[PDB]
Design a protein around this ligand. Structure first.
Ligand SMILES: Cc1ccncc1NC(=O)[C@H]1CCC12CCC2
Ligand SMILES: Cc1ccncc1NC(=O)[C@H]1CCC12CCC2
Lengths: 304, 304
C-alpha cells in the first residue's frame, strides 16, 4: 500500500545523455544509435534568441563546430540537419547503451518522467503531466535544455518530450523528438501566452480510485450523478469535460473497487463544491491530476 | 524555475538489483562487488513470519537454496551469513556494474530516493523522507522487500535504506544496509506501533525558501519571532522544535534570499495559526516537509 508520484527508472535514458556545445552555448543532447538530438537553439547566442533566423544561423555552422561529449569521451560529428526545432547530429559511433526506443507524441493529460540534466549530466528524475494547454510544470534551470521526457514499456523507452523553453510565467515548453512544439510556442525569447489550462478530470478520478484502494475513503458519499450534471460542475471549476472514452478507461479501477464511475464523479462533484474541509487524500490537500488511469493500475499492481 | 519532488537518477542502483529466491519466497537483492544483500525474511514462509526464529530457520538453508538471478543470468552462491536483519550472500562474481558506494545510516528528517522493485526488476523511483518516527510513507506492494533507498554525491551512491516491512497502518519500515532497523520495529508479523510522528520543521522552512526563490511570496509577512516563541507554536502543531543547528543549515538559503531565518519562522507561525486560506505554495495546499535545506540548494542551483 501507499501511493507516490513515481517516475520510471531513468537508467536507460541516463546512458543516452550527452553534452552539446556550439560556440558559447552548451545544452543536453540525446544520443540514440548514431544520432544526437538536441534543441536547435544550441546554435544561438543570447542576442540571436530575440528573433532568430535558424536557417541562416545554421548555415554558418559546420560539423566541427558541434562539440558532442558523452560523459568524458568526444563524439565525431559527420552530419547535421535541422528537423523542425531540433538538430540531428550524425555521429560516427552508435551509442552502445541505446535502449529499445520509440519517438511518440503524447496527448495532453498524459504523464511522463523527466530526467533533468545539466552539461550532459543527470541531476534528478520526476514524474509530471503534459498540461491540457501543452505546457509542463517542470523544474528547469539554464542549462537544462535538451533534457527529455519519456515513458517505459518493459524494455522499450518511448521518448515523448524534449525541453526547450521557459515561458515568462515560469512554466515549461518543449517539443516531441521530431522537433514539433507541443502547443502554440516558438523557440524565441518573446512573450508567449499559454492558453487557459484546466484540471485533467479523468486523472483526478483515477487518483480518487487510488485513494479508495489505499484506504482513504472519507470522500465517498451516498450520491450519484450523470455525465451531463457532472460536466456542468466540471465547467464551473475549470475541469476537462468527462467523456464516455474517459469512463471506459476508468473501467478497470471501477471493476476492482466496485465503485461505478458516475458514483466516483458524485464524490468529485461534492469535493469540488465543498472542498476538503481541512482533510487530505493520499497526503494531498488538493485534487491531484498527475496520475493517469494507467499509472494508477500500474502502481497498484506492481508492473515492472 | 519550478520546484519538483525530485529523485536521484536511479541508473547506478538499477544495475545492482537482483532477484533472490529461497524456497517459495522471492524478493529483491542488492548486488555490490561479490555480495548480495537482501532482507533475512526471504528464508521465511508466511507461517514462519508470526514469530520467526531466524537463527534456526537459516540453519536449515545451504548456499544452493538461495537462488540469485541478475536480470536473466544466475549467480553462484559460495557463502551466506546473517548480519542483524539482512542476509549477505557471497557470490563468485563481482557485479561489473558496481558503482562507487557507501553504506550510511541516515538521520530522521533526512530524505532519499527509493527504487521500488519486484522480482529483481525496477518499476519506479520516488523521493521520500525518513519520518521523525523512523517510518517512511512509501509505495510498496508484496514483492517489494529488498528495494533500497539511496543518495548520490556525484559518482558515489550512499545506500541508506532497505525495505522490509509494511506496518498494519500502511506505513513502511526497514533497515540500514547493515540490517539494523530504523526505529523500534522487528521483522515479525506482529502489531507494532510507530510512535507519534512530527512535521520536519527545518524542511518546511527550506521549502518556504524554495517557494520565495521560485516566486510564491504571498506567505511573507511584516513579522518576526524568537526561537522560544516559534517553538511554542511548533509544539502546539506537532512540529519538530527548531534549534540553532537547524538555523545554521538554513544559512545559505537565508543569504541567497535576504530573508532572516527567524523572519521565515514568523511566516511559518502565521501559516500554522491561520492555514493557507485556500491558496497554494509550490502547487501544494499543505506545508511540505520532504525537502531538506541541502535538497533545495541542489535543485535551485543545478548540482549534477
Ligand atoms: C533560463 C531557462 C531555464 C529553463 N528553461 C529554459 C530557459 N531559457 C530559455 O528558454 C531560453 C534559452 C534560449 C531560450 C529558448 C527560448 C529562449
Ligand atoms: C505485503 C507487504 C507489502 C509491502 N511491504 C511489505 C509487505 N509485507 C511484509 O512486511 C511481510 C512479508 C513478511 C513480512 C515482513 C514482516 C512480515
Amino acid at each position: 500500500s501507499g501511493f507516490r508520484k513515481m517516475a520510471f527508472p531513468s537508467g536507460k535514458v541516463e546512458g543516452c545523455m550527452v553534452q552539446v556545445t556550439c560556440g558559447t552555448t552548451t545544452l543536453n543532447g540525446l544520443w540514440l544509435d548514431d544520432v544526437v538530438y538536441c534543441p536547435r537553439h544550441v546554435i544561438c547566442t543570447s542576442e540571436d534568441m530575440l528573433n532568430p533566423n535558424y536557417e541562416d544561423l545554421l548555415i554558418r555552422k559546420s560539423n566541427h563546430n558541434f562539440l558532442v561529449q558523452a560523459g568524458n569521451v568526444q563524439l565525431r560529428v559527420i552530419g547535421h540537419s535541422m528537423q523542425n526545432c531540433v538538430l540531428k547530429l550524425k555521429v560516427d559511433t552508435a551509442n552502445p547503451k541505446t535502449p529499445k526506443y520509440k519517438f511518440v507524441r503524447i496527448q495532453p493529460g498524459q504523464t511522463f518522467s523527466v530526467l533533468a540534466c545539466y552539461n550532459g549530466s543527470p541531476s534528478g528524475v520526476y514524474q509530471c503531466a503534459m498540461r491540457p494547454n501543452f505546457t509542463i510544470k517542470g523544474s528547469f534551470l539554464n542549462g537544462s535544455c535538451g533534457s527529455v521526457g519519456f515513458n517505459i514499456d518493459y524494455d522499450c523507452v518511448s521518448f515523448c518530450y524534449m525541453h526547450h523553453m521557459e515561458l515568462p510565467t515560469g512554466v515549461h515548453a518543449g517539443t516531441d523528438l521530431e522537433g514539433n512544439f507541443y502547443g502554440p510556442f516558438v523557440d524565441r525569447q518573446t512573450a508567449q501566452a499559454a492558453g487557459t489550462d484546466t484540471t485533467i478530470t479523468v486523472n483526478v478520478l483515477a487518483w480518487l480510485y487510488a485513494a479508495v484502494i489505499n484506504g482513504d475513503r472519507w470522500f465517498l458519499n451516498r450520491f450519484t450523478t450523470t455525465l451531463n450534471d457532472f460536466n456542468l460542475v466540471a465547467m464551473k471549476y475549470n475541469y476537462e469535460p468527462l467523456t464516455q472514452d474517459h469512463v471506459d478507461i476508468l473501467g478497470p479501477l471501477s471493476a476492482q473497487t466496485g465503485i461505478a464511475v458516475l458514483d466516483m464523479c458524485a464524490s468529485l462533484k461534492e469535493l469540488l463544491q465543498n472542498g476538503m474541509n481541512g482533510r487530505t487524500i493520499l497526503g494531498s490537500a488538493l485534487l491531484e491530476d498527475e496520475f493517469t488511469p494507467f499509472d494508477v493500475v500500474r502502481q497498484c499492481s506492481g508492473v515492472t
